[PDB]
Amino acid sequence: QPVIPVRNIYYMLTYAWGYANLEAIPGNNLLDILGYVLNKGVLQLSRRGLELDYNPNTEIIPGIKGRIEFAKTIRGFHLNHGKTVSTFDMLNEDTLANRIIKSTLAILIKHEKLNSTIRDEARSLYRKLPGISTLHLTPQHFSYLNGGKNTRYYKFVISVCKFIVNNSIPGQNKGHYRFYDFERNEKEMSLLYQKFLYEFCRRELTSANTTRSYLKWDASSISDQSLNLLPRMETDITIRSSEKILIVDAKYYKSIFSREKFHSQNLYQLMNYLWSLKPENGENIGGLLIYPHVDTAVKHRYKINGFDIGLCTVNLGQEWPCIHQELLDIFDEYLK
Amino acid sequence: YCLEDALNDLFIPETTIETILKRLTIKKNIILQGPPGVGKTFVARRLAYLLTGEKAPQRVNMVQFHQSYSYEDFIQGYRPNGVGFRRKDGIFYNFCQQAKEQPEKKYIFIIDEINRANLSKVFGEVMMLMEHDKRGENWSVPLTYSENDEERFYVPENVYIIGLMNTADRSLAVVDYALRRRFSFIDIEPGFDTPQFRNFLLNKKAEPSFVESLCQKMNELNQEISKEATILGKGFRIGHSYFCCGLEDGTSPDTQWLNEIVMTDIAPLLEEYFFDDPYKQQKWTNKLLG
Amino acid sequence: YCLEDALNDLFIPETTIETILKRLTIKKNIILQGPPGVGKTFVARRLAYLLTGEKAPQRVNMVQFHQSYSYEDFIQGYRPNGVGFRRKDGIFYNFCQQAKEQPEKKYIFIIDEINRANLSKVFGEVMMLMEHDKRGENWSVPLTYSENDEERFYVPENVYIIGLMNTADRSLAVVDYALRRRFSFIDIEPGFDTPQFRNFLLNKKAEPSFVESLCQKMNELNQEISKEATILGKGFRIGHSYFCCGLEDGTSPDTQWLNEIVMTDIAPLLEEYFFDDPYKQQKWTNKLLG
Amino acid sequence: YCLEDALNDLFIPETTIETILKRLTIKKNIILQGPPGVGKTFVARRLAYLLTGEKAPQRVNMVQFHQSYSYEDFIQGYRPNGVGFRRKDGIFYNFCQQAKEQPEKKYIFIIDEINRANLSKVFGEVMMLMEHDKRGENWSVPLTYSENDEERFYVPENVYIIGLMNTADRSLAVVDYALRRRFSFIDIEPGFDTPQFRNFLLNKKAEPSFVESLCQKMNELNQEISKEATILGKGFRIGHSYFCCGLEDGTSPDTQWLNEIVMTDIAPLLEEYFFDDPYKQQKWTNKLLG
Amino acid sequence: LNDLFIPETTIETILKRLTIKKNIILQGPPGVGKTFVARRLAYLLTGEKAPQRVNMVQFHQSYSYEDFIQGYRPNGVGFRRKDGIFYNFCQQAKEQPEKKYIFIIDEINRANLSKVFGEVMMLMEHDKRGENWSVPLTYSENDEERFYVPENVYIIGLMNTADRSLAVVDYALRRRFSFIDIEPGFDTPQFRNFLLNKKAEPSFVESLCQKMNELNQEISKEATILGKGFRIGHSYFCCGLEDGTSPDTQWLNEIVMTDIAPLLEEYFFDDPYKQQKWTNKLLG
Amino acid sequence: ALNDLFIPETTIETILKRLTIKKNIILQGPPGVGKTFVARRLAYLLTGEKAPQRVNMVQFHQSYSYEDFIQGYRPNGVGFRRKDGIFYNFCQQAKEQPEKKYIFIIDEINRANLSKVFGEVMMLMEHDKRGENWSVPLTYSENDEERFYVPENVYIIGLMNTADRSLAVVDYALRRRFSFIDIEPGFDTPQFRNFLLNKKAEPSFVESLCQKMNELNQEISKEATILGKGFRIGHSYFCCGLEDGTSPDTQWLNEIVMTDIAPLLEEYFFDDPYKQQKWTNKLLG
């Protein structure tokens, strides 16, 4: 029942989120890793200073502050008891962005299985933010934050809270939490795999252009022009360069981790993508299937139906730079 | 006031309007819940005249709520003189007193954009009377601003209250507690896949296939929006009125006319919707043009 | 006055300019969304004179929404008189009365940085009334602070409204989808590729290579700006206003002048824009300089 | 007044100063950004009399913004005379009228710590008006609290605006890129490795050996600060003021004098800059002493 | 200069720093006599025991620019512009230039210090004091009417270092203020001499310093969580023995449970054993 | 009164030792502990005269402000007047009698913002700074003729409750000036047992109930985070209904279980009805 060592997965999430030392931390499990960055990350932010958003405040005060709203005062007759309804912009840290972090820290502390040091340090920080109001977290809160007015650094740490919240399970106790066994599910791991690659390819392969391409069937049907019944087809990634175009279909499977029969059903999707795609330049068309393996990496090339197709693997668990080395080495072969 | 004038032009099925007419006589406190551009404001002006059976402005009143709207203007309150403060009968107080004169004739009060202001701040004490069961002079109460307990106000049974609420904003996910008890929510469909909306175009020199081709995509698109719940619920989906307007000249519908709407209205809206996946914008925008 | 007069100096293609009047004449309320420095403020005063057909200021009104405007400021509110308050008709209410003074001649209301203010708060009742269909006496509605005697405020047909929302500040973006249906949104591009921009430099003592080199680099940059959507979206892409001005004295455009621009204005923006690696900052700055 | 009077005590190069007045005469709006202790406040009072060429403070207005500052204070707002409220023309409004009286003479407004207060709310109407090409009556605009459309405010051409913002806090930064466009941003550096800084010390009986040891040290340290732009940008680096003042009595700057201040001021500052690293604090602190 | 438990060198630093720089921040844990130090010190700088010159306030999160400097606030008739204390105080000192007038701000960390000071955050620096540096105030009706700090004014800030708020860091204010740490001073003889001149046992005083130091050093062990700023102050011992009860082990036992025990909880939160351990360590 | 009070005398003796010196004090304990009734008897004890006039009581809430507490402007028939608050009036009453100890009771203090309410005076109530030396003119004191100083005689008691898990860490202001005291329910105390045996209660019935509640009091505080020691049930519910004229009995207790402990038991857990039912059933028999 093997899975990737937990530390390296964090690197994949980083590219997936589009943006540190993990050697120091001794906790193999993920939550020690993720909390340490969050616990440390807030400390990095606080050094520079946390975000302060001008929050308008309209209230009943004993004097003029900012702009008096004449209507609310006269209607409430606050003049008689020497009061006014006035609008002013107090500058606070109680915004949604900061509130999410603080409530998450409660979840992080409440987690049943966690390093002692991480739990202790977070509890300090939780106290260190007295003004902020705790909240009950939902994706709807994170949904509102798609504006991303905050810095690039904030958006990274916020994404971490999204992973924790959704991948938090109550455990033995009603109050406390228990972390999700994320590695076991392939589907999100696959969506991690696909998203990890797409943003990764933009970074390293500056030489080539990397875009996801939607595809349309060559078919015509008398019944419907819509062809809603037909399967929707959107590439995982397309990595187009002047010399050669290349489409990749990659998925995370448990069977392939075993070094026997081979699970390559995704290939069935791939061929039809090649067909429906027509290149104006007509330089060439190439395909690649890349999967994660644990032990070692194996590469083959094939010439199937007039298309040049590669099957390849990566030895995850080796080392992240050598893995980073291997991926760039891989594409150089096929991108030609 | 014939239904034929009322109901022929409409895109809505005759079933739902009848269902609406049922509950409205029954409960008299109704809310139309749908995205903007489906004729919520459009129907309600007609609906009032349906019930009365006549086109009468006096018996029908329309307002739109906003944050500045308050009890003191709505119901009763004090307005400054040059120095002094004079009490003034508000709309609903003045409006009901007309209804008190003629109990038989139906009276209609229409409140658009109700969610923007809290009902309690405006209505307040009168929410007790407003409910359908507790109406009539039996339940009379003296007002906050009544000079004496003798002066009393009761909501006459004849008045019906209509509320037009749009499910297009994130804040409205937490619907106000005041509304839910007292009003009956009804959902208005986008109403693309309807005969009359199509027939409206066909009378306006439209090809059926171009019309029929469009609806599947619109029906397809709104389905995609409703599938989401986190950012965009079912209530956010597109209404049918972008396409209605702009044909007053007689210019025939076509991709040329349609493309103007897509780029100038629907294209940036999708950027707001699909901020996270700009390519998703490209997916649909290219899909619609084709 | 005519289009030839306006489009003499404007860097925009005629294509949008006719599209603008097309949507306006049908819809009567539109918004131009683009990054700062693309002549949004610049076109707006010229546009007003086109539709009236004359260069008249009286029929036009220009304002800016500054996140502190209110319904009391726009429409109706209470102001102190010497000792006691009085009701003051707002500017828009003051404006509409002028527009209905003569329906024949069109009247324009211009709002800079409209996205800032909470439009639902300011307009209130008008948010429905502004739309083309629901105009005139038929849709007269009584205002909040109107006298108890029925006095109603209706948008004249001749009135046209224009909004000016920059695309930089993401937070200050229109999420009032109910309001976004009244308006039609017109994207404006930076204007680098256009010859009408290029001619403006070449007429002003410029080399075609230096001009053609400039547009090549900027267009590369805006693609890279357009590449991202996480932080820096398409809308953030750089405007042409920086290059437009400062040559009135007779200073010919050259790398010296361009170098002053890059170090002084753009180079701060870039480091503010990225704030992840200086290399990207060092890269693109040197690219423009080299 | 004359130019050389200012430059005698000024550590910044004239090259930057010449760049500054060139922009300011053109742009009329500028922002000076650097760490605290580099003479932003110092230069600004000097700079105004340079631009006017005559030492007239009446034509100079100097203010410090903060959270408790608004459009009502700055521009216009209603405030209590006593029993009766009145419209109080804010300070900037009054300043602009003064400059109108004498259009020839330049009038200067100095805003210290501008980045603190919400400029978006404060400037508002001004945010459009202030730009170099939009000044004058042609672009006159009525304000929020203006009695009618005719009452309008236009920035005079003679006015010059100065913006002063520290770079220490990323929290308080001018993220409004539209606001960024009006202002021309000129960075200011600590300028340790300058003659005029050294001449000031040698003039006050300082060792040239100690001076060369001093400037080299801080130059390396400040460069270390700029390196970790993710953590601490170049804007965070130490200014020259700590060493500047404190010798007024005539105390010679020996190594002991420097060792005293480092312990009292920079040492806790260093502790804050390196919360995680005690050795790095120990490294650089000990580096200075030997 | 007699009953002070802080080193004579440290106070000598301050007077030289204060007179020159005119602004300081005195930061330390509670129970180090920050209030008494400045009040003792303030009379030194004046040279006379004058309390009218000296005014003290204790800031708090709700404290505002309305309170400190200026503000519009109601009279019986209506609203008017009300000069806050500092405007009132600086005018009073401006009336008499020669003498040195002092302003003391306690619990300064609580308020958003930038917000409160506002205009004077620039003006307070020693060089920018005078009519040349005057500015019209925020609420000033007229541009010509301005406010400038006089040179005689000197400012003292008292800071609790045990409640860090990771909300706002200002390094510019740090330029205005010269930060001076204060240690509890258990080791100092003046603290010991006070008790030995109160009929304490010689060992009992010596025993206490060993006990406190072992605890205090542990607090400063983990600079990230806690620091020397967190460690315990001495002032709790000063109070309560002037009634006539000389020190005894029982009296020590009272204070540990009375005062320090919550502090331990505050400090060593969710670690009772460490509290029980360190508590019991002192009692033995 | 000591015999009437159910809490340990040592705590009673300890408190008088603290307050006399510290002059500011706050009691945090479970609801149903007689915290108000505790302080009043203690208030009468310290003065020694059983004087209610010296005693004044206030209950705080979130709206409570400086105008309510200290001073504010209230409308006249025409115009408005400065209107003295409670604490301003109360201390000036105490100012006349310096020898006489005067006490102030602030119930549910933690709800309101002390700073907003007290403001200026929040430092003046600190025992070190008392008397005319620390006099300050008030915000609304237009003239400098009169300044407000709390005289030494004043003692301030704050009644706080450990009932609510929603409550976060106490405000920093409070911790500084106040000594925090935990009050026991007092089931184990003999004075409470003599308060039932004086009512002809069975010793078995008396002793069993002490053990019964203690079994619960341990379990409610056994929870690490959500339910602490402060949560555990107090005795005040048991007092009311026995000396009115009706003797103790298990059926009398049986009603009390349903009345207060049963909903309270639901309130604390709010997760498991069986865990409530098990405990409620355990209590009854």
Ligand SMILES: Nc1nc2c(ncn2[C@@H]2O[C@H](COP(=O)(O)OP(=O)(O)NP(=O)(O)O)[C@@H](O)[C@H]2O)c(=O)[nH]1
């Ligand atoms: N002919 C015709 N027009 C319709 C129909 N439904 C809506 N419209 C048109 O759509 C436009 C706007 O309708 P409206 O009621 O205001 O939508 P709304 O729900 O009120 N908008 P909002 O929610 O933003 O307030 C009008 O031109 C209206 O006549 C319809 O069924 N038939």
Ligand SMILES: Nc1nc2c(ncn2[C@@H]2O[C@H](COP(=O)(O)OP(=O)(O)NP(=O)(O)O)[C@@H](O)[C@H]2O)c(=O)[nH]1
């Ligand atoms: N001559 C000329 N100048 C142009 C043209 N387009 C923009 N500019 C110039 O660029 C500067 C700013 O234009 P402006 O309308 O204010 O852009 P904006 O979008 O309104 N600014 P903002 O978004 O910040 O409000 C002015 O100098 C303007 O004249 C143009 O086509 N011709």
Ligand SMILES: Nc1nc2c(ncn2[C@@H]2O[C@H](COP(=O)(O)OP(=O)(O)NP(=O)(O)O)[C@@H](O)[C@H]2O)c(=O)[nH]1
């Ligand atoms: N004598 C002299 N002093 C200088 C010079 N430059 C800066 N200073 C001194 O440094 C101190 C601060 O000046 P200031 O402008 O306020 O620095 P700043 O960047 O504005 N600081 P902040 O942004 O925090 O307000 C003063 O002592 C000032 O006189 C200089 O060239 N000569």
Ligand SMILES: Nc1nc2c(ncn2[C@@H]2O[C@H](COP(=O)(O)OP(=O)(O)O)[C@@H](O)[C@H]2O)c(=O)[nH]1
């Ligand atoms: N004799 C003497 N008393 C001191 C000393 N330090 C503090 N005290 C006394 O301790 C009591 C409380 O001091 P306080 O200012 O409230 O503590 P702090 O504000 O936290 O530093 C007062 O009586 C102080 O004078 C000292 O060094 N010597």
Ligand SMILES: Nc1nc2c(ncn2[C@@H]2O[C@H](COP(=O)(O)OP(=O)(O)O)[C@@H](O)[C@H]2O)c(=O)[nH]1
């Ligand atoms: N006789 C007597 N009554 C007590 C004692 N303790 C509490 N009580 C009674 O319990 C009631 C007050 O309880 P309390 O907790 O203050 O009510 P709460 O303020 O609503 O929480 C009164 O009937 C008190 O007399 C006590 O020790 N002796």
Ligand SMILES: [Mg+2]
């Ligand atoms: Mg509507």
Ligand SMILES: [Mg+2]
């Ligand atoms: Mg503009």
Ligand SMILES: [Mg+2]
């Ligand atoms: Mg300065």
